[PDB]
Coordinates of C-alpha atoms in Angstrom, one line a residue:
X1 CA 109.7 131.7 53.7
X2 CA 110.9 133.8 56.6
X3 CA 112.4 130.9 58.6
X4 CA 115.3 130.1 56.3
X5 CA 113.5 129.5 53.5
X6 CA 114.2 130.2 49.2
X7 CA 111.7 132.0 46.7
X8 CA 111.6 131.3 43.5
X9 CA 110.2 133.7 40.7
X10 CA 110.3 133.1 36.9
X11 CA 109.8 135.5 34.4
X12 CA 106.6 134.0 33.0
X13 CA 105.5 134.5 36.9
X14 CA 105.2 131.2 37.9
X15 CA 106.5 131.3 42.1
X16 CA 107.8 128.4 44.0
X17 CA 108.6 128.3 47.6
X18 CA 110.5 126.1 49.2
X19 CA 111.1 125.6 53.2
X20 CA 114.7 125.5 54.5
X21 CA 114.7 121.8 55.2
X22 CA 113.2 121.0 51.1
X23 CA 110.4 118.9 53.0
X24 CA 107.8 121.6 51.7
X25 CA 107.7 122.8 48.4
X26 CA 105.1 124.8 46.4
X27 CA 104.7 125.8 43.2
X28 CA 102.7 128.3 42.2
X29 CA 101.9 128.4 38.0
X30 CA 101.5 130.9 36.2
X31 CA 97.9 129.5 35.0
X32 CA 97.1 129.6 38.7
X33 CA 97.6 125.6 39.1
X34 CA 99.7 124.6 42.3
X35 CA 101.6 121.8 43.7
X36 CA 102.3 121.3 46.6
X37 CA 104.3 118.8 48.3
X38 CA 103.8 118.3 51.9
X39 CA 106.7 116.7 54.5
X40 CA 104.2 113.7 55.2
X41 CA 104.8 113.0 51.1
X42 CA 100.9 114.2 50.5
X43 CA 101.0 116.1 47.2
X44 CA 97.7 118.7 46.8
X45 CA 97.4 119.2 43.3
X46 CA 95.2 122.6 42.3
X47 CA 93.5 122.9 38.7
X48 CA 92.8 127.0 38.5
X49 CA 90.5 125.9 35.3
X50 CA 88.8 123.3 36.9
X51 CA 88.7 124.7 40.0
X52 CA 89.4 121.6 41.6
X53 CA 91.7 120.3 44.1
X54 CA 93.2 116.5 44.4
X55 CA 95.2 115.2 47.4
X56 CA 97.4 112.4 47.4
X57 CA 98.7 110.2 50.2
X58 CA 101.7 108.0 49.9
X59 CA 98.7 105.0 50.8
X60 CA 97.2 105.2 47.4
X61 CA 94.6 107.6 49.2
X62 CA 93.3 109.8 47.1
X63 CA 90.6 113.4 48.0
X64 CA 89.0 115.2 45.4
X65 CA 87.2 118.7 46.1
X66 CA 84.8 120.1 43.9
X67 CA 83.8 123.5 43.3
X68 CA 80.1 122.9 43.9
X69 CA 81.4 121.9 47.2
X70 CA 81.4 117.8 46.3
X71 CA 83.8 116.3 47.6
X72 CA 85.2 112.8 47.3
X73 CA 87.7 110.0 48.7
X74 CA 89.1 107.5 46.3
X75 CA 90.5 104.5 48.6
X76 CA 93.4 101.8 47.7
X77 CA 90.8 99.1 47.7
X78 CA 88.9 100.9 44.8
X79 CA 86.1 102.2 47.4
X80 CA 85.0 105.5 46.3
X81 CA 82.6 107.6 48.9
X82 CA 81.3 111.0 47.7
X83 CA 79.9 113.6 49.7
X84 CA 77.4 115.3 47.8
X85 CA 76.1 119.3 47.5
X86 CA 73.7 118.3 49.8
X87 CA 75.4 116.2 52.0
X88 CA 73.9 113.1 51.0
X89 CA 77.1 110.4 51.6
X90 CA 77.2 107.8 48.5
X91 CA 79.9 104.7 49.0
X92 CA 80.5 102.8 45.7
X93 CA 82.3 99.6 46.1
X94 CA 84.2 97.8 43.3
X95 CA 81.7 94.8 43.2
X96 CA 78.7 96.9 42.2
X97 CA 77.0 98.1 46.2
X98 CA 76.2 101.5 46.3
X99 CA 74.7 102.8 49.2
X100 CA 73.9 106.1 50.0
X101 CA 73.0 107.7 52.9
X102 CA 70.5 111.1 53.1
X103 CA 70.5 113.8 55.8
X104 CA 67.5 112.4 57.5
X105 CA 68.8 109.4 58.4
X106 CA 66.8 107.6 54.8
X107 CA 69.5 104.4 53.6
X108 CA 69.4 103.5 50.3
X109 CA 71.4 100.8 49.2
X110 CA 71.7 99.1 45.5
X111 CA 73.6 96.0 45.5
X112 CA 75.3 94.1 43.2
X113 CA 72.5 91.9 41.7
X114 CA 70.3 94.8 41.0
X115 CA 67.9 94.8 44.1
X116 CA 67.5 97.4 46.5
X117 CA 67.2 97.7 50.1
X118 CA 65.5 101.4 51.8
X119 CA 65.4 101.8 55.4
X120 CA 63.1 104.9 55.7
X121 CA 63.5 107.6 58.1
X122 CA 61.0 105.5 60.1
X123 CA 63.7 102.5 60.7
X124 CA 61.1 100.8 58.8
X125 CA 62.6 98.7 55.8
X126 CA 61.9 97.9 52.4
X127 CA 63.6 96.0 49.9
X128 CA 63.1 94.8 46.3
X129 CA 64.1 91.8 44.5
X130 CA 63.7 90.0 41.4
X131 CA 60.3 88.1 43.1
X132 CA 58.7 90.9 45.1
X133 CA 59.1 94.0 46.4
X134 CA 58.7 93.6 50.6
X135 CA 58.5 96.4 53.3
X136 CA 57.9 96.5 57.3
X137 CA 55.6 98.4 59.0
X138 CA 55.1 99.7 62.4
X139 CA 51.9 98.1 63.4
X140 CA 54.2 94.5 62.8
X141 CA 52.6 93.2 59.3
X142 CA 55.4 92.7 56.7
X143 CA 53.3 93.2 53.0
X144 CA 54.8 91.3 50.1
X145 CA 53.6 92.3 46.1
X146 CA 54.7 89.7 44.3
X147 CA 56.3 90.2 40.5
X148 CA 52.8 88.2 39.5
X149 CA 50.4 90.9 41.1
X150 CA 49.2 89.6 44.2
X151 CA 50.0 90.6 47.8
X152 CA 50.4 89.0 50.6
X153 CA 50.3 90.9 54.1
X154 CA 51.9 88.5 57.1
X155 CA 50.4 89.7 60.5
X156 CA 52.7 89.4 63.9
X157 CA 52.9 87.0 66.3

């Protein structure tokens, strides 16, 4: 406001603010929502109920916060990638993969045609499929447990 700018109060107390140039503009509602238009064209939206706050970019970009402290970016291509509480990162992608990664390094990813696919903390993999469920181990054998029950251990070279 000081530089040149106009405030705007209404009698039901909404406030809006607007800079000199009319690149930057916020509006303050009585219900405690807010917009805010930015001179990049990035719009923040505020929800005082919700307590959430959603960013848009002129890309089609989209940023959701949370008040749990989630947070989340909606991408053109339909990607979503949440960032958890706990800081566990989750990227959805519009065929079906999920993959998420945990704070100790742990990969878990789901894909499409319902397998799965862990690489441990270890580095050591794991992954199951309609057949089998297969995982790595440090001494070199790869052990296989078939859907039928039996297991097969493969020994290194």
């Amino acid at each position: 406001l000081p530089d040149g700018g106009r405030l705007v109060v209404f009698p039901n107390g909404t406030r809006k603010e607007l800079s000199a140039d009319g690149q930057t503009v916020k509006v303050m509602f009585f219900n405690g929502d807010v917009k805010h238009t930015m001179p990049d064209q990035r719009v923040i939206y505020y929800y005082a109920e919700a307590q959430t706050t959603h960013i848009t970019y002129p890309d089609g970009m989209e940023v959701l916060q949370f008040p749990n402290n989630q947070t989340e970016k909606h991408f053109p291509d339909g990607r979503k990638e949440i960032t958890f509480p706990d800081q566990t990162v989750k990227t959805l992608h519009p065929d079906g993969r999920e993959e998420s990664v945990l704070t100790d390094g742990t990969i878990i990813q789901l894909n499409p045609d319902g397998s799965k696919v862990i690489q441990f903390n270890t580095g050591q993999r794991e992954i199951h499929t309609a057949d089998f469920k297969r995982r790595e181990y440090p001494d070199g054998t790869v052990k296989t447990v078939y859907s039928d029950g039996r297991q097969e251990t493969q020994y290194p070279t």
